[PDB]
Amino acid sequence: GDHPKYSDMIVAAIQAEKNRAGSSRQSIQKYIKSHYKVGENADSQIKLSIKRLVTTGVLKQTKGVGASGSFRLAK
Incomplete structure (x- = not known):
């Protein structure tokens, strides 16, 4: 239960x-x-x-790609 889904x-x-x-x-x-x-x-x-989530578009892309790799959550 402490390890359900990686996406979660x-x-x-x-x-x-x-x-x-x-x-x-x-x-x-x-x-x-x-x-x-x-x-x-x-x-x-x-x-x-994380890459897959970005690929599916679930995760929003943020600046500093590669540098920080900031990601946003699309509510």
Whole structure:
């Protein structure tokens, strides 16, 4: 129950830091790693899931792409 869906954790991380500038890419994994136990493989999956979410358009794109990789949550 502490590890339901990667997207849910990503959403939770972004919701936790619903900053105007958006949530940094590092912040998404940092929040998840800090609040949820993750492994190296999981980190890779998180990055893939974040990318997929952006790909599906679920996650909004924010500036600093590649630098910070800020992402916004489309409510």
